[PDB]
Short mmCIF file of C-alpha atoms in Angstrom, two decimals:
data_model
loop_
_atom_site.label_atom_id
_atom_site.label_comp_id
_atom_site.label_asym_id
_atom_site.label_seq_id
_atom_site.Cartn_x
_atom_site.Cartn_y
_atom_site.Cartn_z
CA UNK P 1 0.69 -67.79 -66.30
CA UNK P 2 1.12 -65.47 -63.29
CA UNK P 3 1.35 -61.73 -63.92
CA UNK P 4 4.68 -59.97 -63.44
CA UNK P 5 3.25 -58.18 -60.38
CA UNK P 6 2.28 -61.49 -58.78
CA UNK P 7 5.72 -62.95 -59.40
CA UNK P 8 7.24 -59.85 -57.79
CA UNK P 9 5.10 -60.38 -54.67
CA UNK P 10 6.09 -64.08 -54.62
CA UNK P 11 9.81 -63.25 -54.78
CA UNK P 12 9.34 -60.86 -51.85
CA UNK P 13 7.45 -63.53 -49.94
CA UNK P 14 10.11 -66.14 -50.55
CA UNK P 15 12.77 -63.74 -49.25
CA UNK P 16 10.75 -63.25 -46.10
CA UNK P 17 10.34 -66.96 -45.39
CA UNK P 18 14.02 -67.98 -45.94
CA UNK P 19 15.16 -65.17 -43.65
CA UNK P 20 12.58 -65.83 -40.95
CA UNK P 21 14.97 -67.97 -39.28
CA UNK P 22 12.84 -68.88 -36.42
CA UNK P 23 9.77 -69.62 -38.61
CA UNK P 24 8.54 -73.13 -38.12
CA UNK P 25 5.73 -73.31 -40.74
CA UNK P 26 5.34 -76.22 -43.12
CA UNK P 27 5.31 -73.63 -45.88
CA UNK P 28 8.81 -72.46 -44.98
CA UNK P 29 9.92 -76.05 -44.58
CA UNK P 30 8.80 -77.20 -48.02
CA UNK P 31 8.99 -74.05 -50.16
CA UNK P 32 12.60 -74.63 -51.14
CA UNK P 33 14.12 -72.47 -53.84
CA UNK P 34 13.78 -75.37 -56.28
CA UNK P 35 10.07 -75.82 -55.59
CA UNK P 36 9.51 -72.07 -55.53
CA UNK P 37 11.25 -71.49 -58.84
CA UNK P 38 9.37 -74.21 -60.65
CA UNK P 39 5.92 -73.10 -59.39
CA UNK P 40 6.13 -69.33 -59.07
CA UNK P 41 4.89 -68.42 -62.56
CA UNK P 42 2.24 -71.18 -62.83
CA UNK P 43 -1.52 -70.52 -62.76
CA UNK P 44 -4.58 -72.75 -62.66
CA UNK P 45 -7.09 -72.63 -65.50
CA UNK P 46 -9.37 -70.52 -63.28
CA UNK P 47 -6.55 -68.07 -62.56
CA UNK P 48 -5.16 -69.15 -59.18
CA UNK P 49 -1.42 -68.50 -58.71
CA UNK P 50 1.15 -69.65 -56.18
CA UNK P 51 0.45 -66.39 -54.35
CA UNK P 52 -3.20 -67.53 -53.88
CA UNK P 53 -1.75 -70.60 -52.17
CA UNK P 54 1.08 -69.22 -49.98
CA UNK P 55 0.16 -65.61 -49.17
CA UNK P 56 -1.32 -66.34 -45.75
CA UNK P 57 1.82 -68.14 -44.60
CA UNK P 58 4.00 -65.38 -45.90
CA UNK P 59 1.91 -62.74 -44.09
CA UNK P 60 1.57 -64.82 -40.91
CA UNK P 61 4.96 -66.30 -40.27
CA UNK P 62 3.69 -68.01 -37.12
CA UNK P 63 1.36 -70.23 -39.17
CA UNK P 64 1.67 -73.92 -38.47
CA UNK P 65 0.95 -74.81 -42.09
CA UNK P 66 0.68 -71.57 -44.06
CA UNK P 67 -0.97 -72.57 -47.32
CA UNK P 68 -4.54 -72.84 -48.56
CA UNK P 69 -6.08 -74.16 -51.79
CA UNK P 70 -7.70 -71.44 -53.92
CA UNK P 71 -9.43 -74.00 -56.19
CA UNK P 72 -9.45 -77.76 -56.55
CA UNK P 73 -7.05 -77.65 -59.48
CA UNK P 74 -4.45 -76.02 -57.24
CA UNK P 75 -3.96 -79.35 -55.43
CA UNK P 76 -2.73 -80.77 -58.73
CA UNK P 77 -0.85 -77.82 -60.25
CA UNK P 78 0.92 -77.01 -56.98
CA UNK P 79 1.32 -80.64 -55.88
CA UNK P 80 5.10 -80.27 -55.43
CA UNK P 81 4.29 -77.99 -52.50
CA UNK P 82 0.94 -79.41 -51.30
CA UNK P 83 2.04 -83.04 -51.37
CA UNK P 84 4.95 -82.88 -48.90
CA UNK P 85 3.02 -80.55 -46.62
CA UNK P 86 0.06 -82.98 -46.62
CA UNK P 87 2.46 -85.86 -45.88
CA UNK P 88 4.07 -83.97 -43.02
CA UNK P 89 0.85 -82.69 -41.47
CA UNK P 90 -1.28 -85.84 -41.92
CA UNK P 91 1.05 -88.25 -40.22
CA UNK P 92 0.34 -91.78 -41.39
CA UNK P 93 -1.01 -90.73 -44.78
CA UNK P 94 1.78 -92.05 -46.90
CA UNK P 95 2.91 -91.01 -50.32
CA UNK P 96 1.53 -94.18 -51.93
CA UNK P 97 -1.76 -94.11 -49.99
CA UNK P 98 -5.12 -93.08 -51.38
CA UNK P 99 -7.65 -91.79 -48.93
CA UNK P 100 -10.54 -94.30 -48.74
CA UNK P 101 -13.92 -93.47 -50.20
CA UNK P 102 -16.60 -92.40 -47.77
CA UNK P 103 -17.67 -94.98 -45.25
CA UNK P 104 -19.62 -94.02 -42.14
CA UNK P 105 -19.73 -97.69 -41.19
CA UNK P 106 -22.13 -99.04 -38.63
CA UNK P 107 -23.35 -95.90 -36.94
CA UNK P 108 -25.23 -98.14 -34.49
CA UNK P 109 -22.03 -99.44 -32.96
CA UNK P 110 -20.90 -96.21 -31.21
CA UNK P 111 -21.48 -95.89 -27.50
CA UNK P 112 -22.08 -93.32 -24.83
CA UNK P 113 -18.54 -92.69 -23.60
CA UNK P 114 -19.77 -91.31 -20.27
CA UNK P 115 -23.30 -92.44 -19.46
CA UNK P 116 -23.20 -90.87 -15.97
CA UNK P 117 -22.10 -87.50 -17.32
CA UNK P 118 -19.22 -87.28 -14.84
CA UNK P 119 -16.63 -86.00 -17.33
CA UNK P 120 -18.08 -85.22 -20.75
CA UNK P 121 -20.03 -81.96 -20.97
CA UNK P 122 -20.92 -82.39 -24.63
CA UNK P 123 -20.08 -84.43 -27.72
CA UNK P 124 -19.80 -83.06 -31.27
CA UNK P 125 -18.96 -84.41 -34.71
CA UNK P 126 -18.09 -81.92 -37.42
CA UNK P 127 -17.34 -82.39 -41.08
CA UNK P 128 -16.72 -80.06 -43.96
CA UNK P 129 -17.66 -80.09 -47.60
CA UNK P 130 -17.04 -78.12 -50.75
CA UNK P 131 -19.85 -77.89 -53.25
CA UNK P 132 -19.18 -79.53 -56.59
CA UNK P 133 -18.62 -76.86 -59.24
CA UNK P 134 -17.46 -74.00 -57.01
CA UNK P 135 -13.93 -72.91 -56.28
CA UNK P 136 -12.73 -72.15 -52.77
CA UNK P 137 -12.87 -68.82 -51.00
CA UNK P 138 -10.08 -66.91 -52.83
CA UNK P 139 -11.51 -67.63 -56.26
CA UNK P 140 -15.22 -67.15 -55.45
CA UNK P 141 -17.06 -64.26 -57.05
CA UNK P 142 -19.64 -62.32 -55.05
CA UNK P 143 -22.25 -63.80 -57.39
CA UNK P 144 -21.04 -67.32 -56.61
CA UNK P 145 -21.13 -66.74 -52.86
CA UNK P 146 -24.76 -65.62 -53.26
CA UNK P 147 -25.79 -68.41 -55.61
CA UNK P 148 -24.23 -71.01 -53.36
CA UNK P 149 -25.98 -69.59 -50.32
CA UNK P 150 -29.36 -69.59 -52.04
CA UNK P 151 -28.88 -73.26 -53.01
CA UNK P 152 -27.80 -74.18 -49.52
CA UNK P 153 -30.59 -72.21 -47.83
CA UNK P 154 -33.20 -73.86 -50.05
CA UNK P 155 -31.79 -77.31 -49.34
CA UNK P 156 -31.51 -76.90 -45.58
CA UNK P 157 -34.94 -75.24 -45.33
CA UNK P 158 -36.33 -78.39 -46.95
CA UNK P 159 -35.05 -80.60 -44.12
CA UNK P 160 -37.77 -82.32 -42.10
CA UNK P 161 -38.17 -84.09 -38.78
CA UNK P 162 -35.30 -83.87 -36.31
CA UNK P 163 -33.29 -81.77 -38.77
CA UNK P 164 -36.07 -79.19 -39.27
CA UNK P 165 -34.92 -75.71 -38.40
CA UNK P 166 -34.15 -72.14 -39.32
CA UNK P 167 -31.70 -70.52 -41.72
CA UNK P 168 -30.17 -67.15 -40.82
CA UNK P 169 -28.14 -65.19 -43.35
CA UNK P 170 -25.38 -63.10 -41.78
CA UNK P 171 -26.09 -60.22 -44.14
CA UNK P 172 -28.37 -57.75 -42.41
CA UNK P 173 -28.56 -59.82 -39.23
CA UNK P 174 -29.89 -57.82 -36.30
CA UNK P 175 -28.02 -57.39 -33.05
CA UNK P 176 -30.77 -59.21 -31.21
CA UNK P 177 -30.47 -62.24 -33.44
CA UNK P 178 -26.70 -62.15 -33.22
CA UNK P 179 -26.93 -62.25 -29.44
CA UNK P 180 -29.43 -65.17 -29.47
CA UNK P 181 -27.05 -67.13 -31.71
CA UNK P 182 -24.06 -66.19 -29.59
CA UNK P 183 -25.86 -67.42 -26.48
CA UNK P 184 -26.14 -70.84 -28.14
CA UNK P 185 -22.56 -70.68 -29.49
CA UNK P 186 -23.98 -70.86 -33.02
CA UNK P 187 -22.58 -67.64 -34.47
CA UNK P 188 -19.36 -67.35 -36.41
CA UNK P 189 -17.55 -64.09 -37.04
CA UNK P 190 -15.42 -62.62 -39.79
CA UNK P 191 -12.20 -64.62 -40.18
CA UNK P 192 -8.95 -63.96 -38.42
CA UNK P 193 -5.68 -62.75 -39.89
CA UNK P 194 -4.86 -66.20 -41.27
CA UNK P 195 -8.07 -66.31 -43.24
CA UNK P 196 -7.94 -62.63 -44.19
CA UNK P 197 -4.45 -62.97 -45.65
CA UNK P 198 -5.70 -66.02 -47.60
CA UNK P 199 -8.36 -63.80 -49.19
CA UNK P 200 -10.91 -66.11 -47.59
CA UNK P 201 -13.27 -63.39 -46.39
CA UNK P 202 -13.94 -61.25 -49.44
CA UNK P 203 -17.43 -59.74 -49.67
CA UNK P 204 -18.14 -60.63 -46.03
CA UNK P 205 -20.88 -61.37 -45.06
CA UNK P 206 -22.41 -61.91 -48.52
CA UNK P 207 -23.31 -65.57 -48.97
CA UNK P 208 -22.58 -66.47 -45.32
CA UNK P 209 -25.19 -67.93 -43.05
CA UNK P 210 -26.07 -70.24 -40.21
CA UNK P 211 -28.67 -72.99 -39.92
CA UNK P 212 -29.69 -74.90 -36.85
CA UNK P 213 -32.44 -77.38 -36.10
CA UNK P 214 -35.19 -76.73 -33.50
CA UNK P 215 -33.55 -79.16 -31.04
CA UNK P 216 -30.26 -77.25 -31.19
CA UNK P 217 -28.38 -80.51 -31.90
CA UNK P 218 -27.54 -79.72 -35.56
CA UNK P 219 -25.69 -76.70 -36.92
CA UNK P 220 -24.48 -75.71 -40.38
CA UNK P 221 -22.18 -72.84 -41.21
CA UNK P 222 -22.30 -71.63 -44.79
CA UNK P 223 -19.15 -70.09 -46.25
CA UNK P 224 -17.23 -69.64 -42.97
CA UNK P 225 -14.00 -71.39 -44.02
CA UNK P 226 -15.38 -74.09 -46.28
CA UNK P 227 -18.57 -73.90 -48.27
CA UNK P 228 -20.26 -76.09 -45.70
CA UNK P 229 -19.37 -76.99 -42.14
CA UNK P 230 -21.87 -79.48 -40.84
CA UNK P 231 -22.05 -80.24 -37.16
CA UNK P 232 -24.00 -82.52 -34.87
CA UNK P 233 -23.79 -82.00 -31.10
CA UNK P 234 -25.53 -82.66 -27.82
CA UNK P 235 -24.95 -82.58 -24.11
CA UNK P 236 -23.51 -85.68 -22.53
CA UNK P 237 -21.50 -88.46 -24.13
CA UNK P 238 -23.72 -90.25 -26.61
CA UNK P 239 -21.40 -90.31 -29.59
CA UNK P 240 -23.65 -92.80 -31.39
CA UNK P 241 -26.63 -90.46 -31.38
CA UNK P 242 -24.47 -87.55 -32.44
CA UNK P 243 -22.83 -89.42 -35.29
CA UNK P 244 -26.04 -91.03 -36.49
CA UNK P 245 -27.63 -87.60 -36.82
CA UNK P 246 -24.60 -86.12 -38.63
CA UNK P 247 -24.48 -88.93 -41.16
CA UNK P 248 -28.19 -88.76 -41.86
CA UNK P 249 -27.89 -85.02 -42.44
CA UNK P 250 -24.87 -85.21 -44.72
CA UNK P 251 -26.36 -88.03 -46.83
CA UNK P 252 -29.61 -86.07 -47.23
CA UNK P 253 -27.88 -82.81 -48.15
CA UNK P 254 -25.76 -84.65 -50.75
CA UNK P 255 -28.92 -85.58 -52.72
CA UNK P 256 -29.35 -81.93 -53.65
CA UNK P 257 -25.83 -80.62 -53.21
CA UNK P 258 -23.09 -82.86 -54.60
CA UNK P 259 -19.66 -82.49 -53.06
CA UNK P 260 -16.13 -81.97 -54.34
CA UNK P 261 -14.11 -85.13 -53.91
CA UNK P 262 -10.74 -86.40 -54.97
CA UNK P 263 -9.55 -89.99 -55.52
CA UNK P 264 -6.43 -89.53 -53.42
CA UNK P 265 -7.20 -86.62 -51.10
CA UNK P 266 -10.82 -87.37 -50.20
CA UNK P 267 -13.20 -84.49 -49.61
CA UNK P 268 -11.58 -81.32 -50.86
CA UNK P 269 -11.34 -78.40 -48.48
CA UNK P 270 -9.90 -74.94 -48.48
CA UNK P 271 -7.32 -75.76 -45.80
CA UNK P 272 -5.30 -78.92 -46.45
CA UNK P 273 -5.53 -79.72 -42.73
CA UNK P 274 -9.20 -80.61 -43.30
CA UNK P 275 -8.85 -83.11 -46.17
CA UNK P 276 -9.73 -86.81 -46.25
CA UNK P 277 -12.72 -87.46 -44.01
CA UNK P 278 -12.75 -83.83 -42.87
CA UNK P 279 -14.04 -85.26 -39.59
CA UNK P 280 -13.48 -83.72 -36.24
CA UNK P 281 -15.21 -85.75 -33.53
CA UNK P 282 -14.76 -84.21 -30.12
CA UNK P 283 -15.86 -84.06 -26.55
CA UNK P 284 -15.79 -81.09 -24.24
CA UNK P 285 -14.47 -82.87 -21.22
CA UNK P 286 -13.15 -82.22 -17.74
CA UNK P 287 -10.21 -84.39 -16.63
CA UNK P 288 -8.77 -82.53 -13.64
CA UNK P 289 -6.32 -85.16 -12.47
CA UNK P 290 -4.88 -85.96 -15.88
CA UNK P 291 -4.65 -82.28 -16.60
CA UNK P 292 -2.93 -80.60 -13.66
CA UNK P 293 0.14 -81.60 -15.65
CA UNK P 294 -0.58 -80.35 -19.17
CA UNK P 295 2.46 -82.12 -20.61
CA UNK P 296 1.20 -85.47 -19.42
CA UNK P 297 -2.35 -84.99 -20.69
CA UNK P 298 -0.78 -84.29 -24.09
CA UNK P 299 1.33 -87.39 -24.05
CA UNK P 300 -1.60 -89.64 -23.23
CA UNK P 301 -3.84 -87.95 -25.79
CA UNK P 302 -1.15 -88.28 -28.46
CA UNK P 303 -0.77 -91.97 -27.68
CA UNK P 304 -4.44 -92.50 -28.54
CA UNK P 305 -4.29 -90.25 -31.64
CA UNK P 306 -6.20 -87.49 -29.90
CA UNK P 307 -5.67 -83.76 -30.01
CA UNK P 308 -6.23 -81.44 -27.06
CA UNK P 309 -7.49 -77.88 -27.64
CA UNK P 310 -10.21 -76.74 -17.06
CA UNK P 311 -12.42 -77.82 -19.96
CA UNK P 312 -10.68 -79.37 -22.96
CA UNK P 313 -11.92 -80.07 -26.45
CA UNK P 314 -10.39 -83.44 -27.23
CA UNK P 315 -10.79 -84.84 -30.72
CA UNK P 316 -9.45 -87.38 -33.19
CA UNK P 317 -6.19 -86.16 -34.58
CA UNK P 318 -6.38 -88.23 -37.81
CA UNK P 319 -8.33 -86.97 -40.84
CA UNK P 320 -6.70 -88.68 -43.82
CA UNK P 321 -5.95 -92.33 -44.49
CA UNK P 322 -8.84 -93.75 -42.45
CA UNK P 323 -12.60 -93.91 -42.93
CA UNK P 324 -15.12 -91.72 -41.15
CA UNK P 325 -16.11 -94.74 -39.12
CA UNK P 326 -12.49 -95.28 -38.14
CA UNK P 327 -11.89 -91.62 -37.23
CA UNK P 328 -14.94 -91.49 -34.97
CA UNK P 329 -13.99 -94.86 -33.46
CA UNK P 330 -10.47 -93.53 -32.70
CA UNK P 331 -12.01 -90.65 -30.79
CA UNK P 332 -14.41 -92.98 -28.99
CA UNK P 333 -11.81 -95.51 -27.96
CA UNK P 334 -9.33 -92.81 -27.00
CA UNK P 335 -11.79 -90.94 -24.83
CA UNK P 336 -12.83 -94.18 -23.12
CA UNK P 337 -9.19 -94.75 -22.28
CA UNK P 338 -8.57 -91.19 -21.07
CA UNK P 339 -11.57 -91.42 -18.78
CA UNK P 340 -10.23 -94.70 -17.41
CA UNK P 341 -6.82 -93.13 -16.82
CA UNK P 342 -8.42 -90.14 -15.09
CA UNK P 343 -10.43 -92.37 -12.79
CA UNK P 344 -7.46 -94.47 -11.84
CA UNK P 345 -4.51 -92.79 -10.30
#
């Protein structure tokens, strides 16, 4: 299916990976000559080639992963590459596993992990969604970016009550508005070299926008990396409040905007690191004792399936092979334990 010129670029890219002897990407690890040869000329029905999958990891050798999905079909056609990378990245999500269908569980059971506000500055839960019927960044037309944005804007502008707010398209945005959004940490910028090389930012900023509610506890990014990135946040540690709000918002949006979903992989996303639940529950937290020795903070976080990114963003590491409820509960329980460790000792 792939054009001769594409195959030529793929052969060059393969040569670069195999040689890049110090490259540690999952792309280099799993793009063996056998896998490469069997996939290099293949193309999805919409026109996505292996180059639309691997180009970013070829261009950025320092990528951790190095592949993106150009359309949903790519996860199937290029499964011999996606599947082992997904297995390797999403530790615990086994070959024979299917990611569970959506289950937010009892969103009344989550607690405030730091009622006194001694450690946790803020709590956030983010998820991502792709809109049913639309391909992912690389395969989107300018017209699709715009149509998608109009749908999303209409839907979000319809939100009432606590979720009521304002939509801001990036196109034509004034400097004064940019600064106001920056001051609230609500603005996103044009993608970095990883996204650029994935052809994820074509037509920027057409079809990109930001929504937030009046209370500044709910934020949506439209066409930043995924079609939708939906975030609930507030100061302090009340993970229950944060998660309750997120789930209400996602369930309401879904009524007008159905989502792309896969029986095995869960919610489909542009980057395979965001599959499954897509959920990133995090605290911005200060743990000065446990830090001090970065190595040690890492070990303890890892033990509780947390990821660390003197203020740390500490989140659930697991995305696939557990429910949303379970992913948020892993963050909650892990943060409760880190706080205990910090206090003691």
